[PDB]
Structure 1
Amino acid sequence: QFDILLGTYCNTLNFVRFLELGLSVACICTKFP
């Protein structure tokens, strides 16, 4: 008898545009040292 392993797969999720929408329509970035 013997055992055979299939393998290991990693999840590759996607993303959405947030840098040009969330920081442009909701909040405004302004540096103030």
Structure 2
Amino acid sequence: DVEFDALLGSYCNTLSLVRFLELGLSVACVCTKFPELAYMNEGRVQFEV
């Protein structure tokens, strides 16, 4: 008597590594970064019209 079972292969995904600056929406930002923000209170921006 000869019998056997089997595993035929095992399949994964691939996580798509998405940068934000590859997106078309990244025109609608002005992305500049802070090494600190939690130490900052209310900041503001001036406009002269």
TM-score of the pair, normalised by structure 1: 0.36
User: In terms of Rg, which structure is larger?
Assistant: 2
TM-score of the pair, normalised by structure 2: 0.34
Relative contact order higher in (CA < 8 Å, ≥ 6 apart)? 1
